[PDB]
Amino acid sequence: NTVTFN
Amino acid sequence: NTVTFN
Amino acid sequence: NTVTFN
Amino acid sequence: NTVTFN
Amino acid sequence: NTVTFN
Amino acid sequence: NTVTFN
Amino acid sequence: NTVTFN
Amino acid sequence: NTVTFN
Amino acid sequence: NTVTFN
Amino acid sequence: NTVTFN
Amino acid sequence: NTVTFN
Amino acid sequence: NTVTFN
Amino acid sequence: NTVTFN
Amino acid sequence: NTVTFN
Amino acid sequence: NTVTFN
Amino acid sequence: NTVTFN
Amino acid sequence: NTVTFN
Amino acid sequence: NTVTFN
K3 vs N1: CA distance, rounded Å: 16
Q: Give the residue from K1, F5, P1 showing the smallest Cα distance to C5.
A: K1
Which residues on chain H are in Cβ contact (under 8 Å) with Q2? Answer: none
Q: Residue H2: beta bridge partners?
A: G2, I2
Q: Looking at the complex, does the CB of residue A2 fall below 8 Å from at least one CB of chain O? A: no
Chains that touch O (3 or more CB pairs under 8 A): A, G, N, P
Experimental method: X-ray
Q: Looking at the complex, does the CB of residue G3 fall below 8 Å from at least one CB of chain P? A: yes
Q: Give the residue from R4, O2, F4, G3 showing the smallest Cα distance to B2.
A: G3
Assess contact for L5 and N4: CB atoms under 8 A: no
Which residues on chain E are in Cβ contact (under 8 Å) with J2? Answer: none
The data reach a resolution, in angstroms, of 1.6
